[PDB]
Short mmCIF file of C-alpha atoms and ligand atoms in Angstrom, two decimals:
data_model
loop_
_atom_site.label_atom_id
_atom_site.label_comp_id
_atom_site.label_asym_id
_atom_site.label_seq_id
_atom_site.Cartn_x
_atom_site.Cartn_y
_atom_site.Cartn_z
CA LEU P 2 6.37 9.88 0.77
CA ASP P 3 9.71 11.64 1.18
CA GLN P 4 12.05 10.10 3.79
CA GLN P 5 12.02 13.20 5.97
CA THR P 6 8.24 12.96 5.99
CA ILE P 7 8.43 9.26 6.74
CA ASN P 8 11.22 10.17 9.22
CA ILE P 9 9.17 12.82 11.04
CA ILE P 10 6.18 10.52 10.99
CA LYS P 11 8.20 7.77 12.76
CA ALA P 12 9.66 10.29 15.20
CA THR P 13 6.38 11.95 16.32
CA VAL P 14 3.90 9.11 16.68
CA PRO P 15 4.94 8.62 20.30
CA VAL P 16 4.40 12.26 21.27
CA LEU P 17 1.16 11.99 19.34
CA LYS P 18 0.19 8.76 21.02
CA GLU P 19 1.08 10.26 24.41
CA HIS P 20 -1.67 12.92 23.75
CA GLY P 21 -4.34 10.72 22.26
CA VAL P 22 -7.21 11.40 24.69
CA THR P 23 -7.08 15.08 24.11
CA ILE P 24 -6.42 14.85 20.39
CA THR P 25 -9.30 12.40 20.11
CA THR P 26 -11.43 14.47 22.38
CA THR P 27 -10.74 17.74 20.66
CA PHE P 28 -10.97 15.86 17.37
CA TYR P 29 -14.64 14.79 17.89
CA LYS P 30 -15.99 18.05 19.26
CA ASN P 31 -14.55 19.81 16.26
CA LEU P 32 -15.60 17.23 13.74
CA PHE P 33 -19.30 17.33 14.91
CA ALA P 34 -19.26 21.02 15.63
CA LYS P 35 -17.96 22.15 12.21
CA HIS P 36 -19.48 19.43 10.05
CA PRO P 37 -23.06 18.89 11.06
CA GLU P 38 -23.80 16.90 7.75
CA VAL P 39 -21.72 13.92 8.96
CA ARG P 40 -23.24 13.88 12.38
CA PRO P 41 -25.96 11.70 10.88
CA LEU P 42 -23.43 9.13 9.73
CA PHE P 43 -22.51 8.65 13.33
CA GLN P 53 -18.29 8.31 19.25
CA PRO P 54 -15.64 5.85 17.83
CA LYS P 55 -12.66 6.29 20.19
CA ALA P 56 -9.99 4.54 18.16
CA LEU P 57 -9.88 6.92 15.19
CA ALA P 58 -6.71 8.70 16.21
CA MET P 59 -4.95 5.57 17.46
CA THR P 60 -5.91 3.73 14.28
CA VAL P 61 -4.28 6.49 12.27
CA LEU P 62 -1.29 6.59 14.55
CA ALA P 63 -1.06 2.82 14.25
CA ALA P 64 -1.15 3.01 10.49
CA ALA P 65 1.35 5.85 10.48
CA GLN P 66 3.75 3.62 12.29
CA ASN P 67 3.62 0.96 9.56
CA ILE P 68 3.88 3.73 7.03
CA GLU P 69 6.57 1.75 5.31
CA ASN P 70 4.43 -1.41 5.16
CA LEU P 71 0.82 -0.30 4.91
CA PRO P 72 -0.21 -3.77 3.66
CA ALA P 73 0.34 -4.95 7.20
CA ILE P 74 -2.77 -3.01 8.33
CA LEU P 75 -5.13 -4.39 5.70
CA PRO P 76 -6.89 -6.86 7.88
CA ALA P 77 -8.04 -4.02 10.21
CA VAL P 78 -8.43 -1.56 7.35
CA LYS P 79 -10.73 -4.18 5.93
CA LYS P 80 -12.91 -4.74 9.03
CA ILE P 81 -13.45 -1.02 9.32
CA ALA P 82 -14.34 -0.58 5.53
CA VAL P 83 -17.43 -2.66 5.82
CA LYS P 84 -18.59 -0.36 8.63
CA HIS P 85 -17.71 2.72 6.60
CA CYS P 86 -19.53 1.42 3.54
CA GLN P 87 -22.43 0.53 5.75
CA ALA P 88 -22.58 4.08 7.03
CA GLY P 89 -22.31 5.81 3.60
CA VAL P 90 -18.72 6.98 4.04
CA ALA P 91 -17.52 8.66 0.83
CA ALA P 92 -14.04 9.48 -0.43
CA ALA P 93 -15.09 13.12 -0.06
CA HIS P 94 -15.53 12.80 3.70
CA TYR P 95 -11.86 11.86 3.96
CA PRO P 96 -10.62 15.46 3.80
CA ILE P 97 -12.72 16.89 6.64
CA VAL P 98 -11.72 14.06 8.99
CA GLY P 99 -8.13 14.77 8.01
CA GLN P 100 -8.56 18.51 8.54
CA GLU P 101 -10.05 18.04 12.01
CA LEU P 102 -7.35 15.48 12.88
CA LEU P 103 -4.45 17.66 11.87
CA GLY P 104 -6.07 20.55 13.72
CA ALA P 105 -6.26 18.58 16.99
CA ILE P 106 -2.68 17.41 16.38
CA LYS P 107 -1.65 21.02 15.97
CA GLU P 108 -3.67 22.20 18.89
CA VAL P 109 -2.04 19.62 21.14
CA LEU P 110 1.57 19.60 19.96
CA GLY P 111 1.67 23.28 20.94
CA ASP P 112 5.13 24.67 20.00
CA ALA P 113 6.39 21.37 18.58
CA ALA P 114 3.45 21.64 16.18
CA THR P 115 5.96 23.01 13.70
CA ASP P 116 5.11 23.67 10.07
CA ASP P 117 7.00 20.81 8.61
CA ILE P 118 5.61 18.44 11.24
CA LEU P 119 2.04 19.25 10.44
CA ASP P 120 2.77 19.02 6.71
CA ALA P 121 4.24 15.51 7.07
CA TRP P 122 1.20 14.39 9.10
CA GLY P 123 -0.85 15.93 6.39
CA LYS P 124 0.93 13.78 3.83
CA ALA P 125 0.61 10.73 5.98
CA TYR P 126 -3.15 10.88 6.59
CA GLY P 127 -3.57 11.35 2.81
CA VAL P 128 -1.72 8.11 2.08
CA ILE P 129 -3.47 6.44 4.91
CA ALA P 130 -6.83 7.69 3.73
CA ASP P 131 -6.13 6.26 0.19
CA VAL P 132 -6.05 2.73 1.50
CA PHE P 133 -9.47 2.98 3.08
CA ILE P 134 -10.62 5.12 0.16
CA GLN P 135 -9.57 2.36 -2.34
CA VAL P 136 -10.81 -0.60 -0.41
CA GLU P 137 -14.27 0.91 0.12
CA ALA P 138 -14.57 1.95 -3.55
CA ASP P 139 -13.97 -1.73 -4.17
CA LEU P 140 -16.44 -2.63 -1.49
CA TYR P 141 -19.11 -0.37 -2.96
CA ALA P 142 -18.22 -1.60 -6.47
CA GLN P 143 -18.59 -5.19 -5.32
CA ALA P 144 -21.91 -4.52 -3.56
CA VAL P 145 -23.78 -5.63 -6.79
CA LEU N 2 9.65 4.72 -2.80
CA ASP N 3 10.97 8.04 -4.00
CA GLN N 4 9.21 10.16 -6.66
CA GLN N 5 12.21 9.77 -8.92
CA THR N 6 12.41 6.02 -8.93
CA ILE N 7 8.66 6.35 -9.23
CA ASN N 8 9.30 8.77 -12.13
CA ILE N 9 11.54 6.16 -13.80
CA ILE N 10 9.03 3.32 -13.25
CA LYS N 11 6.20 5.26 -14.92
CA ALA N 12 8.45 6.37 -17.80
CA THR N 13 9.73 2.89 -18.63
CA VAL N 14 6.70 0.66 -18.07
CA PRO N 15 5.59 1.35 -21.62
CA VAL N 16 9.05 0.36 -22.89
CA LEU N 17 8.97 -2.87 -20.80
CA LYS N 18 5.44 -3.63 -21.99
CA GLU N 19 6.49 -3.37 -25.66
CA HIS N 20 9.00 -6.24 -25.07
CA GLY N 21 6.66 -8.08 -22.69
CA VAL N 22 6.70 -11.31 -24.69
CA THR N 23 10.48 -11.64 -24.70
CA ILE N 24 10.82 -10.70 -21.09
CA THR N 25 8.20 -13.34 -20.24
CA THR N 26 9.93 -16.25 -22.05
CA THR N 27 13.42 -15.25 -21.01
CA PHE N 28 12.03 -14.88 -17.48
CA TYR N 29 10.70 -18.45 -17.35
CA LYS N 30 13.48 -20.34 -19.12
CA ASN N 31 15.73 -18.77 -16.62
CA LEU N 32 13.58 -19.10 -13.59
CA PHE N 33 13.20 -22.87 -13.90
CA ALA N 34 16.71 -23.29 -15.27
CA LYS N 35 18.60 -21.40 -12.53
CA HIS N 36 16.33 -22.48 -9.53
CA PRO N 37 15.24 -26.10 -9.74
CA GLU N 38 13.65 -26.13 -6.22
CA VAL N 39 10.67 -24.08 -7.42
CA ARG N 40 9.81 -26.15 -10.37
CA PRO N 41 7.65 -28.39 -8.24
CA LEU N 42 5.45 -25.38 -7.23
CA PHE N 43 4.76 -25.12 -10.88
CA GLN N 53 4.48 -20.96 -16.63
CA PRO N 54 1.77 -18.27 -15.92
CA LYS N 55 2.14 -15.83 -18.84
CA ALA N 56 0.95 -12.82 -16.85
CA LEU N 57 3.73 -12.70 -14.24
CA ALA N 58 5.36 -9.92 -16.18
CA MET N 59 2.22 -7.95 -17.15
CA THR N 60 0.97 -8.22 -13.62
CA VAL N 61 4.13 -6.57 -12.27
CA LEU N 62 4.04 -3.94 -15.06
CA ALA N 63 0.36 -3.50 -14.24
CA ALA N 64 1.24 -2.83 -10.62
CA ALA N 65 4.12 -0.53 -11.42
CA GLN N 66 1.62 1.53 -13.35
CA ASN N 67 -0.27 1.99 -10.07
CA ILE N 68 2.87 2.35 -8.06
CA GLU N 69 1.32 5.49 -6.64
CA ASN N 70 -1.89 3.63 -5.66
CA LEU N 71 -0.98 0.04 -4.96
CA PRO N 72 -4.31 -0.48 -3.13
CA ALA N 73 -5.94 -0.25 -6.54
CA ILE N 74 -4.43 -3.67 -7.34
CA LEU N 75 -5.70 -5.47 -4.25
CA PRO N 76 -8.60 -7.36 -5.73
CA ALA N 77 -6.25 -8.96 -8.26
CA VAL N 78 -3.45 -9.40 -5.71
CA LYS N 79 -6.02 -11.06 -3.52
CA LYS N 80 -7.11 -13.70 -6.05
CA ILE N 81 -3.45 -14.54 -6.90
CA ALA N 82 -2.42 -14.83 -3.14
CA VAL N 83 -4.88 -17.58 -2.67
CA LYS N 84 -3.28 -19.52 -5.56
CA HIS N 85 0.21 -18.69 -4.21
CA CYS N 86 -0.67 -19.92 -0.75
CA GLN N 87 -2.15 -23.06 -2.25
CA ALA N 88 1.14 -23.63 -4.07
CA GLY N 89 3.31 -22.92 -0.98
CA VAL N 90 4.89 -19.70 -2.20
CA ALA N 91 7.19 -18.24 0.49
CA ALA N 92 8.39 -14.68 1.15
CA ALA N 93 11.75 -16.31 0.66
CA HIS N 94 10.81 -17.14 -2.94
CA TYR N 95 10.05 -13.50 -3.69
CA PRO N 96 13.69 -12.61 -4.23
CA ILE N 97 14.53 -15.25 -6.80
CA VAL N 98 11.54 -14.18 -8.94
CA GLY N 99 12.66 -10.55 -8.81
CA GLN N 100 16.21 -11.60 -9.55
CA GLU N 101 14.99 -13.52 -12.61
CA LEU N 102 12.60 -10.73 -13.78
CA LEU N 103 15.15 -7.99 -13.45
CA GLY N 104 17.63 -10.15 -15.37
CA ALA N 105 15.20 -10.53 -18.25
CA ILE N 106 14.61 -6.78 -18.02
CA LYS N 107 18.29 -5.93 -18.58
CA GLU N 108 18.94 -8.73 -20.96
CA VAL N 109 16.09 -7.31 -23.04
CA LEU N 110 16.56 -3.56 -22.79
CA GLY N 111 20.22 -3.76 -23.80
CA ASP N 112 22.02 -0.37 -23.46
CA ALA N 113 18.80 1.41 -22.47
CA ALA N 114 19.14 -0.88 -19.44
CA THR N 115 21.03 1.77 -17.63
CA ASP N 116 21.83 0.91 -13.97
CA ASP N 117 19.48 3.45 -12.46
CA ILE N 118 16.64 2.05 -14.53
CA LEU N 119 17.50 -1.35 -13.25
CA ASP N 120 17.93 0.00 -9.74
CA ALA N 121 14.52 1.70 -9.95
CA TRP N 122 12.88 -1.47 -11.19
CA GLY N 123 14.70 -3.19 -8.34
CA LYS N 124 13.01 -1.03 -5.76
CA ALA N 125 9.68 -1.23 -7.59
CA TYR N 126 9.44 -5.02 -7.61
CA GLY N 127 10.37 -5.07 -3.91
CA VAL N 128 7.55 -2.70 -3.04
CA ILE N 129 5.20 -4.74 -5.16
CA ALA N 130 6.38 -8.01 -3.71
CA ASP N 131 5.58 -6.97 -0.07
CA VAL N 132 1.89 -6.51 -0.82
CA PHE N 133 1.76 -10.06 -1.99
CA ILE N 134 3.96 -11.12 0.88
CA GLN N 135 1.70 -9.42 3.46
CA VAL N 136 -1.49 -10.65 2.05
CA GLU N 137 -0.20 -14.18 1.86
CA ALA N 138 1.32 -14.07 5.30
CA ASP N 139 -2.12 -12.98 6.29
CA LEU N 140 -3.73 -15.82 4.44
CA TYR N 141 -1.40 -18.36 5.93
CA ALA N 142 -2.06 -17.00 9.42
CA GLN N 143 -5.79 -16.88 8.91
CA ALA N 144 -5.87 -20.63 8.06
CA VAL N 145 -5.88 -21.12 11.26
C1 HEM B 201 -8.13 7.14 7.77
C2 HEM B 201 -9.22 7.80 8.15
C3 HEM B 201 -10.22 6.99 8.99
C4 HEM B 201 -9.90 6.09 9.91
C5 HEM B 201 -8.47 5.65 10.35
C6 HEM B 201 -11.17 5.61 10.41
C7 HEM B 201 -11.36 4.82 11.51
C8 HEM B 201 -12.52 4.33 12.06
C9 HEM B 201 -12.60 3.27 13.05
C10 HEM B 201 -11.35 2.61 13.69
C11 HEM B 201 -13.88 2.98 13.24
C12 HEM B 201 -14.62 1.95 14.12
C13 HEM B 201 -14.78 0.50 13.60
C14 HEM B 201 -15.27 -0.54 14.59
O1 HEM B 201 -14.41 -1.02 15.38
O2 HEM B 201 -16.50 -0.83 14.61
C15 HEM B 201 -14.65 3.87 12.40
C16 HEM B 201 -16.02 3.84 12.35
C17 HEM B 201 -16.64 4.81 11.61
N1 HEM B 201 -16.00 5.73 10.81
FE1 HEM B 201 -14.16 6.04 10.33
N2 HEM B 201 -12.24 6.29 9.83
C18 HEM B 201 -11.65 7.12 8.89
C19 HEM B 201 -12.25 8.01 8.03
C20 HEM B 201 -13.59 8.23 8.18
C21 HEM B 201 -14.35 9.19 7.41
C22 HEM B 201 -13.65 10.12 6.42
C23 HEM B 201 -15.63 9.13 7.77
C24 HEM B 201 -16.82 10.01 7.29
C25 HEM B 201 -17.71 10.60 8.09
C26 HEM B 201 -15.71 8.05 8.76
C27 HEM B 201 -16.84 7.60 9.43
C28 HEM B 201 -17.01 6.56 10.33
C29 HEM B 201 -18.28 6.07 10.81
C30 HEM B 201 -19.63 6.73 10.44
C31 HEM B 201 -18.05 5.02 11.59
C32 HEM B 201 -19.03 4.02 12.24
C33 HEM B 201 -19.62 4.21 13.64
C34 HEM B 201 -20.02 2.80 13.97
O3 HEM B 201 -21.00 2.35 13.30
O4 HEM B 201 -19.18 2.16 14.68
N3 HEM B 201 -14.46 7.48 8.96
N4 HEM B 201 -13.80 4.65 11.65
C1 HEM B 202 4.94 -9.81 -7.38
C2 HEM B 202 5.55 -10.97 -7.65
C3 HEM B 202 4.63 -12.03 -8.28
C4 HEM B 202 3.65 -11.81 -9.18
C5 HEM B 202 3.15 -10.51 -9.86
C6 HEM B 202 3.08 -13.10 -9.42
C7 HEM B 202 2.15 -13.31 -10.40
C8 HEM B 202 1.49 -14.49 -10.66
C9 HEM B 202 0.29 -14.62 -11.46
C10 HEM B 202 -0.42 -13.45 -12.20
C11 HEM B 202 -0.17 -15.85 -11.24
C12 HEM B 202 -1.40 -16.56 -11.83
C13 HEM B 202 -2.76 -16.37 -11.14
C14 HEM B 202 -3.97 -16.81 -11.91
O1 HEM B 202 -4.35 -16.05 -12.85
O2 HEM B 202 -4.52 -17.87 -11.51
C15 HEM B 202 0.75 -16.55 -10.36
C16 HEM B 202 0.69 -17.89 -10.02
C17 HEM B 202 1.73 -18.53 -9.40
N1 HEM B 202 2.86 -17.93 -8.90
FE1 HEM B 202 3.24 -16.03 -8.77
N2 HEM B 202 3.78 -14.11 -8.74
C18 HEM B 202 4.73 -13.44 -7.98
C19 HEM B 202 5.67 -14.00 -7.13
C20 HEM B 202 5.79 -15.38 -7.13
C21 HEM B 202 6.87 -16.09 -6.45
C22 HEM B 202 7.97 -15.32 -5.69
C23 HEM B 202 6.64 -17.40 -6.57
C24 HEM B 202 7.50 -18.56 -6.03
C25 HEM B 202 7.64 -19.69 -6.71
C26 HEM B 202 5.42 -17.55 -7.34
C27 HEM B 202 4.83 -18.74 -7.71
C28 HEM B 202 3.66 -18.95 -8.41
C29 HEM B 202 2.98 -20.22 -8.60
C30 HEM B 202 3.51 -21.58 -8.06
C31 HEM B 202 1.82 -19.95 -9.21
C32 HEM B 202 0.60 -20.84 -9.48
C33 HEM B 202 0.40 -21.63 -10.78
C34 HEM B 202 -1.04 -22.07 -10.83
O3 HEM B 202 -1.51 -22.69 -9.83
O4 HEM B 202 -1.71 -21.62 -11.81
N3 HEM B 202 4.89 -16.31 -7.65
N4 HEM B 202 1.76 -15.69 -10.01
#
């Protein structure tokens, strides 16, 4: 990621974290509402916080691997697919936007957009490996 | 890292791979010669190809995890320390420049410098995590 992105990411986590409940809450209603096909895969409260937590170590993502790895098994067990990553991201960024309000500036959203992507790639790679190794 | 240094890593990995052999032998002679304290921990031929391999995936380091994971266990069994990381990189980058010659322009070196660092931390994290998990 570009420093500014990384910079905005480090700067906004707190504001983000301060608004978790809502973000999370709005996040789930919207996820289930607009994407009925995933409803079967499923509540999990720590989605937003997990992302925020990863975002914070965005300069040392390896640090989060132990947790990233506990979660992967669950994901693989539930049929999570790399293709689901984008709709979770879309709903997340929407909640983020919805809750920032005015601070939800363009470049802020964009950077969060970049961040989730990178973040998603760790789970998305680990699970691939998990599915690959499931034989 | 910055998609620039990244652009230089990708561009030069092929060059580095062509001279792999020489970098390898120069790397070792020098490693053990210049830093006698690590000789007890030990000439794995793939130290250089492994880094080059990683640099390839510098945009998706999680791709390398399964390999990184099998190596970490060996490393931890041998008592490799985060503190050792820097000598290795010093010795590898030295081979790199001593082998490229005048192509070994400073920015190339500097890019490789950042690259190894990034690569090192994945090993460092995993290992730190192995050490901690043991118990
Ligand atoms: C980076 C993006 C994601 C993060 C950070 C993440 C995070 C989480 C977390 C923290 C848990 C609960 C683990 C536990 O403590 O048991 C979880 C469970 C789950 N996640 Fe994700 N997830 C991500 C992407 C997705 C995607 C794209 C899907 C696709 C629908 C998904 C589906 C699920 C499901 C179905 C569960 C399991 C419910 C259960 O059995 O506990 N996740 N996820
Ligand atoms: C990213 C940096 C490093 C890479 C890519 C790396 C790579 C390797 C490879 C590929 C192996 C052999 C694994 C196998 O196939 O069994 C290995 C083993 C080893 N490495 Fe590293 N290494 C790195 C950093 C270091 C450092 C900093 C030290 C400090 C001395 C170190 C010490 C050793 C030792 C002692 C062995 C084990 C020899 C054996 O038991 O076979 N490595 N390393």
